[PDB]
Amino acid sequence: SLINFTDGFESTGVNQQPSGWGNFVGWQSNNPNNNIGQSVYALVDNTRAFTGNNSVHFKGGAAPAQIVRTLPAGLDKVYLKAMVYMSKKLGNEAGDNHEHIFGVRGNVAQADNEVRFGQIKGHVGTNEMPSDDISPPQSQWYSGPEIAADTWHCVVVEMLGGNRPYHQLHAYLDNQLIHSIDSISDWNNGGVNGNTQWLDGKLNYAFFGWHSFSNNNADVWMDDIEISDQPISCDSRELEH
Amino acid sequence: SLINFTDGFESTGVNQQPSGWGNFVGWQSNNPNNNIGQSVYALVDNTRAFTGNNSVHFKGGAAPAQIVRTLPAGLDKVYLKAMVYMSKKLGNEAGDNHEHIFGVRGNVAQADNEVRFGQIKGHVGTNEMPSDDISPPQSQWYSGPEIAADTWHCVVVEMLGGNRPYHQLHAYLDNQLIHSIDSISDWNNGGVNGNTQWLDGKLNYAFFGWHSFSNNNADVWMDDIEISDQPISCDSRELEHH
Ligand SMILES: [Ca+2]
Ligand SMILES: [Ca+2]
Ligand SMILES: [Mg+2]
Ligand SMILES: [Mg+2]
Ligand SMILES: [Mg+2]
Ligand SMILES: [Mg+2]
């Protein structure tokens, strides 16, 4: 209703930043050096794709490599979805700090006010900034469902904000629930400093890519991105490839 | 002489960013949220100092916390100096990736074109971006001189660029030489991609603070910072012979 967006990257040339998207590359919003000569980039690639010719290829690590899209004013909730292919797994990973593929941010220039989905402490899940809280709690770290390397996955994240008693997040892999934030006790460290409305101010930009706080370089490809304020799920082709 | 700058932080109020410096805090140049309410900052502090009442207190980690000074155009060399007090050590440290306290950068917006002195792979030394090369080589890693936690140190970094056959860096602790780069074989990964003039374009901004690529939070205090195109050293008081 406020946004119904899809992108398969098919109209953008190879080695170019996806048309219509901004970037967050090397900790800089709209880095002017997002190009195939750098070690960190977010560029269209026609050598791997889920549909059509093209995907977006993120090459990064500790230095983020992301595309970023503005979200409409007044969103209460958002759904992020993509076909995702990664060089390493997420989940069930000893030694991890945290790493993420999808998120929303409040301020374009900074990664210090955002919600980050991928894994935390080696379990699929979420990190919020600026609290630096993480979900799930410590009991579940370094275990749980895996998002395997070297295959296409259909990943969906639902973020429910606005006028409800407690903001929520649900993440899915191939339409199976793999992570939930339903109440304050789903956070490790006291629940985003006690803020029940913890998506407030976060839904200004959507971002996709690779960002590791575990010192791991990766290559990630995404295709068939969808962003909506109404629910999204994976279709027969995305499930059964 | 184009620059001969000293700062003891005595004229700035406590909890304020040092007057006349820029910042690089949480990966943003001149971050407007550099204040005592945040988890990452670079602020004047009177709870510890080497001279007078005040030092600059860096609180950071993976997220950098730094002050930044613009350097004059056309430097061929620069010396960076400070009294430094750290919550953890540099050097002789197992499992370290790299971390740094001093540096110079070419472009104010990014940490991807700079020279970084502190430790690399647990030995005191230097990391260059964008090559990501490190000095000394692998044989010396996780060993060598220590810059101990919880005491004041007088640290000097000498960077020699310009028209010489190979750019050099030397670092000194209490006037003792602890780290040198003066030949391509001092680099682990084959020498900044072959660039003999590897300080070219790097002497635009000097920075001081804490930045870990080893996921270590720290608190660092510095006092009596100096920047110059002529040599800088430590006086007997700074050496703490007592
Ligand atoms: Ca496509
Ligand atoms: Ca002082
Ligand atoms: Mg699949
Ligand atoms: Mg669809
Ligand atoms: Mg001393
Ligand atoms: Mg002096």
The tally of CA atoms less than 13 A away on the side-chain side of residue B89 is: 17
Burial class from Cβ neighbours inside 10 Å (0-12, 13-18, 19+) for residue A174 reads middle
- The structure's method of determination equals X-ray
Phi and psi for B150 in degrees, rounded to 5?
65, 35
In a domain, A39, yes or no: no
Is residue B77 a contact partner of residue B197, using CB atoms and an 8 Å limit? no
State whether B28 and A130 contact (CB < 8 Å).
no
Question: Min CA distance, A197 vs chain B (Å)?
Answer: 20
- Listed in sequence order, the residues at least 6 apart from A172 whose beta carbon sits closer than 8 Å to its beta carbon are A155, A156, A157, A158, A178, A233, A234
- Listed in sequence order, the residues at least 6 apart from A43 whose beta carbon sits closer than 8 Å to its beta carbon are A14, A15, A16, A17, A34, A35, A36, A56, A57, A59
**Can you say how many angstroms the Cα of residue A159 is from the centroid of all Cα atoms in its chain?**
12
B180 touching A (Cβ < 8 Å): no
Peptide bond into B136 cis (omega under 30): yes
Helix (H) or strand (E) holding B173: strand B168-173
Peptide bond into B137 cis (omega under 30): no
Dihedral sign of CA atoms A23, A28, A33, A34 in order: negative
Total domain count for chain A?
Answer: 1
- Listed in sequence order, the residues at least 6 apart from B2 whose beta carbon sits closer than 8 Å to its beta carbon are B72, B74, B75, B229
Rounded Cα distance, A214 and A64, in Å: 12
Among B26, B97, B112, beta carbon nearest to A110: B26
* Distance (Å) from CA A153 to ligand 3 centroid: 4
Q: What is the stated resolution of the deposited model, in angstroms?
A: 1.5
Burial class from Cβ neighbours inside 10 Å (0-12, 13-18, 19+) for residue A73 reads exposed
What is chain A's alpha carbon radius of gyration, rounded to the nearest angstrom?
16
Residue range of the domain that includes A180 = 73-239
Helix-strand-coil split of chain B, %, nearest 5: 5, 45, 50
Tell which B residues from 50 to 109 touch A, by Cβ distance under 8 Å. 62-63, 97, 109
In a domain, A98, yes or no: yes
> What is each CA distance from B213 to A18, A133, B186, B220, in whole angstroms?
30, 21, 21, 16
Dihedral sign of CA atoms B48, B53, B56, B57 in order: positive
Rounded Cα distance, A68 and A29, in Å: 9
- Listed in sequence order, the residues at least 6 apart from B110 whose beta carbon sits closer than 8 Å to its beta carbon are A26, A27, A28
A111 touching B (Cβ < 8 Å): yes
Rounded Cα distance, A175 and B201, in Å: 51
In a domain, A111, yes or no: yes
Among A39, A62, A109, beta carbon nearest to B28: A109
State whether B213 and A111 contact (CB < 8 Å).
no
Strand partners, B168: B160
Q: How does DSSP classify residue B89?
A: -
Rounded Cα distance, A48 and A51, in Å: 9
* Distance (Å) from CA B11 to ligand 6 centroid: 17
In a domain, A53, yes or no: no
Helix (H, G, I), strand (E, B) or coil at B57: strand
Phi and psi for A7 in degrees, rounded to 5?
-150, 125
Is residue A17 a contact partner of residue A61, using CB atoms and an 8 Å limit? no
CA angle, A15 then A241 then A91, to 5°: 75
Phi and psi for B185 in degrees, rounded to 5?
-80, -5
Helix (H, G, I), strand (E, B) or coil at B186: helix
Rounded Cα distance, A74 and B167, in Å: 55
CATH of the domain at A220: 2.60.120.200
Rounded Cα distance, B199 and B95, in Å: 28
